[PDB]
Amino acid sequence: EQNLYDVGPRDSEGPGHYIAISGNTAAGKTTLIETLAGSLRAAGADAVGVSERVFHHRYLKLMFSASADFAFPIQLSFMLERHLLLLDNLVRRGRTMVMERSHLDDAMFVREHVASGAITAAQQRAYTEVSGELNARIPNPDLIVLMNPEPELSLERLARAEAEGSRPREFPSDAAKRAWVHRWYDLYQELHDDYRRRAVDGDLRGTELLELDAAASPEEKIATVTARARSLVVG
Amino acid sequence: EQNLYDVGPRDSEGPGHYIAISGNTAAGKTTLIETLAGSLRAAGADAVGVSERVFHHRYLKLMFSASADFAFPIQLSFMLERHLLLLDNLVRRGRTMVMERSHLDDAMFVREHVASGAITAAQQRAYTEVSGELNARIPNPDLIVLMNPEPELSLERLARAEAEGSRPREFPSDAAKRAWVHRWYDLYQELHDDYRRRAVDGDLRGTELLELDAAASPEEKIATVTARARSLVVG
Numbered sequence: 233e234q235n236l237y238d239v240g241p242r243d244s245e246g247p248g249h250y251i252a253i254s255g256n257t258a259a260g261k262t263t264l265i266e267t268l269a270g271s272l273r274a275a276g277a278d279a280v281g282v283s284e285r286v287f288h289h290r291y292l293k294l295m296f297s298a299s300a301d302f303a304f305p306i307q308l309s310f311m312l313e314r315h316l317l318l319l320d321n322l323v324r325r326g327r328t329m330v331m332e333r334s335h336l337d338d339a340m341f342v343r344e345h346v347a348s349g350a351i352t353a354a355q356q357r358a359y360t361e362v363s364g365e366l367n368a369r370i371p372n373p374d375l376i377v378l379m380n381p382e383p384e385l386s387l388e389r390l391a392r393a394e395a396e397g398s399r400p401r402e403f404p405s406d407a408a409k410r411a412w413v414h415r416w417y418d419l420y421q422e423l424h425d426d427y428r429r430r431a432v433d434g435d436l437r438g439t440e441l442l443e444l445d446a447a448a449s450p451e452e453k454i455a456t457v458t459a460r461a462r463s464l465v466v467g
Numbered sequence: 468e469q470n471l472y473d474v475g476p477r478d479s480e481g482p483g484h485y486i487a488i489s490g491n492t493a494a495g496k497t498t499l500i501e502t503l504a505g506s507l508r509a510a511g512a513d514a515v516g517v518s519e520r521v522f523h524h525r526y527l528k529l530m531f532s533a534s535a536d537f538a539f540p541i542q543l544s545f546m547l548e549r550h551l552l553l554l555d556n557l558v559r560r561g562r563t564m565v566m567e568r569s570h571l572d573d574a575m576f577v578r579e580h581v582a583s584g585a586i587t588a589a590q591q592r593a594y595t596e597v598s599g600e601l602n603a604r605i606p607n608p609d610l611i612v613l614m615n616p617e618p619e620l621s622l623e624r625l626a627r628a629e630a631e632g633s634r635p636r637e638f639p640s641d642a643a644k645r646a647w648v649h650r651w652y653d654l655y656q657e658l659h660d661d662y663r664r665r666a667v668d669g670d671l672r673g674t675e676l677l678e679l680d681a682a683a684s685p686e687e688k689i690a691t692v693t694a695r696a697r698s699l700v701v702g
């Protein structure tokens with residue numbers, strides 16, 4: 233439907249535009265992603281919204297129920313599938329991608345599993361060497377939107393989704409779900425501090441970093457993001 | 468149908484049995500794989516035959532039409548998807564797997580792309596470090612069957628399959644198809660010499676290496692492989 237896996241020739245030169253949300257969106261931001269992509273299509277871009285549920289491996293549950301065995305290959309899978317989707321749609325085909333998560337944020341999830349002992353130091357070093365080669369072939373996002381919901385909100389949304397059958401219970405216990413969500417939130421607070429430095433005198437000079445007002449209603453929030461993304465659409 | 472992606476608990480201890488074909492099966496060996504798996508099910512094993520067409524990424528054609536960009540991530544994908552399939556079905560769930568290709572043979576296909584310049588030396592080093600960590604978690608196959616068809620036969624089978632629509636044209640030209648098939652055949656002749664040494668005083672002590680009589684009819688060939696695989700089935 234979104235033609236994400238078309239190996240035919242480009243039907244346009246250069247890469248498209250790359251917009252990414254960054255935060256602990258453990259319950260997803262699918263309405264925001266899809267609405268934003270739709271607003272870019274209205275402006276005339278070939279725009280696709282890509283939630284993480286496009287990248288979840290069929291074995292996803294095992295990264296949380298059998299972490300010592302599956303967290304390393306499943307983390308490799310997130311990185312790799314995201315890489316290939318961007319390399320084809322954004323770079324090769326010049327499309328506009330609105331991502332729930334950029335290629336810059338996957339390493340944080342490896343760091344979590346390393347601190348728990350599910351991924352070894354040697355596995356992490358191998359991941360880092362492949363990640364460095366892959367990320368060197370993908371442009372930085374053009375617009376990064378920092379949105380880290382608080383863990384209690386993430387968990388309330390997840391609990392409702394699991395109860396209503398709209399997503400499977402992917403964790404092995406209620407406590408494990410809460411603990412991963414809190415660990416990711418804590419890491420994302422540090423990651424976002426890093427982003428504010430990166431954007432000013434690190435490798436994200438050249439990227440627009442957008443921070444929201446957490447007290448702003450949702451409606452002021454999509455409107456703010458939409459305005460900045462529409463600056464990129466070339467008719 | 469084959470329940471390859473079941474994240475539920477094991478329904479059996481220890482890993483299952485691991486049988487692999489090794490050779491330039493560019494047109495596939497799907498009848499042999501499926502027949503052999505069926506013979507092991509008859510003997511009472513939970514056996515699955517896995518052809519490479521289970522692992523072909525949706526972007527497969529780009530590794531041959533845009534090799535300089537896609538050969539590295541697509542090779543990572545072959546390794547990773549094969550790893551996860553084995554880690555779940557063979558190791559975690561103790562099933563018996565009859566593979567068209569084992570995890571030991573993927574590195575040869577990276578070597579091909581390195582010699583053509585499609586994969587850089589630095590990309591290959593990163594691949595090798597991840598491959599070493601992944602392969603350390605997968606048992607050696609128990610029975611390896613050397614079958615390297617000659618390139619003219621591979622190409623005759625491929626040409627017929629493409630003409631009849633039973634598989635897409637995955638190469639960008641007739642000449643590129645012939646050249647990859649010949650490069651793989653040549654590498655496999657060297658790989659099979661290596662196997663004969665590995666099995667006797669390298670890391671495949673402990674594995675049964677089966678070599679066929681290339682002059683033997685197909686029927687003597689499935690019968691020979693079936694006899695040796697059935698030595699492994701525990702009722």
Ligand SMILES: Nc1ccn([C@@H]2S[C@H](CO)[C@@H](O)[C@H]2O)c(=O)n1
Binds near residue numbers: 285307311338342
């Ligand atoms: N590299 C990654 C990216 C995402 N996730 C999980 S997958 C699930 C998305 O629906 C949600 O739990 C994310 O936090 C992950 O574990 N590792």
Ligand SMILES: Nc1ccn([C@@H]2S[C@H](CO)[C@@H](O)[C@H]2O)c(=O)n1
Binds near residue numbers: 572574651
């Ligand atoms: N690591 C690998 C494994 C397999 N193949 C190709 S994929 C196709 C199978 O139908 C056939 O062409 C194989 O030779 C590959 O390129 N790299």
